[model samples]
Target: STGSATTTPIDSLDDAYITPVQIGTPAQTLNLDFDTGSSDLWVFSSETTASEVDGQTIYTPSKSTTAKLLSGATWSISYGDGSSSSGDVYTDTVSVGGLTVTGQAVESAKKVSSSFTEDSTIDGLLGLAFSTLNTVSPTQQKTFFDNAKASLDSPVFTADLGYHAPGTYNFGFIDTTAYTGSITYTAVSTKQGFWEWTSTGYAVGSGTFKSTSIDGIADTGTTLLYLPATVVSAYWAQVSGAKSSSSVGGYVFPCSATLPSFTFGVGSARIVIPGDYIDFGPISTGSSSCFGGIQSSAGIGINIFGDVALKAAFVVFNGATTPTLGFASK
Candidate 1:
């Protein structure tokens, strides 16, 4: 059945959003991050090494009659942040919002990087990217949506990420009430197992919009927006007193500086990220130096339109033969 669920920010600081998901028969509810960047539904479990896991919750398969381990199957995933998790697989009934899917692969982490282990608030990650990115071997795993889509009214999901406000993750159907204005649609290349598309171009501050094309991925899991070094260099030049900080990472500037907005193009839609968003906060309390949230993608060949960018628009990720992305002002 079609359904929608509310996503609350992991914290008021806006690091990430958390949505409740159910797994197994009796239903062990976990607060999972709905990440559009990667594909792999993994959770901390009893299998997680004791020393590695501190205060995080664990999924217990023994409590569910439907839980069945796919013998010899294992999964390992390393994120862009260098954090990783590797675990064995267990198939069970997984439910998100009110939609349910049987035979969902739930990887129970036996080993986790410090990022996953140290974050007690996030119990797991429900990947919304293409199934080709799934970490399972021998037979790649299908995400909950992939298996549940056939039973849905339509194969579509809408991301309504808010700026310091409550947002929603709607499955199977798009809620018209969630956004204003018509949704501007653009084609996406799922070849990279991402919701990737080439931007018509971007502009620095209120400068003339460039028509140059640049490939980028819509990643809700990534906290900041990352573009090409050339683009970032141009943007920083517009900011007074901004400098590259090796110790702080990325570009940093005075905490009190008033910066200009950065805009990215999706077809005809020109979504602009506000200047305040560029001020990522002071490097330390009472410190005047602050980091710029929009940095260079650098080595990575693609720009990452992360949470900071997604918050500026309502994005519809369509899982059709030729997937498309629809965007509109929130």
Candidate 2:
């Protein structure tokens, strides 16, 4: 039976930011980060006495009318950005729209950082990118998909991010109409949480970037597209009236004019970077505008294709069958 449904809107911190309905419920609401860098679902629990969670939203298992915690299980996670958190493992009945999944594996944090704690609107992160980076081990833990796949009508998951538009994040069975055709899927690597794939290359303006031919993983955890400085500078040059200014401590440009579109070839897929994504906002210092698309993060090892890029297509983090990341239409 193929079942489909839209994600319910939780109380969002901002207009563009909202929690997933399936993960959040009347009893216990889980704030999922919805990252593509890693595939895992974790939440901050009531057990966390750390000061970092002072302002952040914390899930109370005891308060929930329908919540459960798994015994003899613990979880810990670390990010490349130099942040980490640890907590106990638990299970609970989570609901979204009319769909309900029981025995969902969740992490209750005992220690967290101030940045994570300050964001009270989002309780935790829902990683739907891929399964290799999963913090939970097969011997010690089961993935969110592994636990809930049987319950889903079609056994599929999709993320529709509208960063420039309304910014929506959804799950459950996929809506076939939103996609053009079947998405090409890649096998997951043995590495933890990182999905490995090669970029065929990049195109800026009407030309292809030849100087810096590169290949790396596409990640959503990262906010900007990381590339070689040569490629980054070359792409920025094509923008109309492009000028370097101090905005976000990097180059800013006027996006009022039609800018060149950059296309990235991932495996057999070609993803385009829209013009609006390049314009951050109107420049405050000058009459010009700030550039939102590309930025300089020289040392950042990973070349992440953030939400801006992901929003253009449908992504599937297939964990139920084999560990693989599949792309398809809405």
Candidate 3:
């Protein structure tokens, strides 16, 4: 059985976490966002418009002897944040840590959304959702993780995101030191193109746990925790001076006010999120007004437990025959 491969997650200026990946014959290194929310490993490349290639590194297939063109094949994708990228495909060597997948379909951008063009540090997205969500035409692509899974001892990966600090994504293994106590496991329903699950509701501070089952996806690419409209309002009601006012641009509250903690119910497990984590960051200078890290996922159809939720615990995304989600406090 193959062992585990590990990579340190690079913290971004605006809270997006980037994972380092190597592509091409000579291992052209690029930092990509390991987005569990998506399943296409697309990159900014030679095919991309020069104007769109700002400070980010681009993949050069022409220079790689192993890079082969997948003629007539193309891919395009859009994100909830209004980010989009489209391009032709190439088969090349892609590696994460000690594992390598030869001839992986790498989507090269010929056009990108305005949001992607402005994000200078992000070179691409490494989608880790499911193969069904892959975007390559004629033949959908397999994520680097999925491509390398068969040889792995266990078909699972773990995300260890930190609060304003460092984190690591481990493949084929769980670093026990990354978490505490026994991990609680729950079944996952993946008809959707995401790591979807049902939470037995949530709570604000030390209140009685809401026993409602809310459906959501565990998305690493997104920066905030999003619940249904009513759930978002409930959390805000606990925060002094907090309001979901468009004037303040979402659930804004006084930066200096003492905040309450949050909790989520999953298969008898209570994952407690601290107060400081809920206060994502300040909306302006001097830190007088701050934006809530947890917001409403209205119109999105699914609640999203983004970075704020993952950082609160150690999470295992199992890709086995009967998929399941395992969580433990860190």
Error of 2 at 86 (Å): 2.3
What are the per-residue Cα lDDT tens digits for candidate 1 across 232-310? 9999998889998888778998877899998888888798888876677888888989879889899666799998889
**CA lDDT of each prediction against the hidden true structure:** 0.88, 0.60, 0.85
**Candidate achieving the largest lDDT:** 1
- Cα RMSD (Å) between model 3 and the true structure? 1.7
Clashing pairs in 1: none
In candidate 3, what are the lDDT values of residues 169-226, reduced to their tens digit? 8888878888899899987888987899999878899998999998889898988898
Error of 2 at 127 (Å): 2.4
TM-score of each: 0.97, 0.76, 0.95
Write down the lDDT that model 2 would get.
Answer: 0.60
**Candidates, ranked, lDDT:** 1, 3, 2
Query: Could you tell me the lDDT of residue 172 within candidate 2?
Result: 54
Clashing pairs for model 3 are none
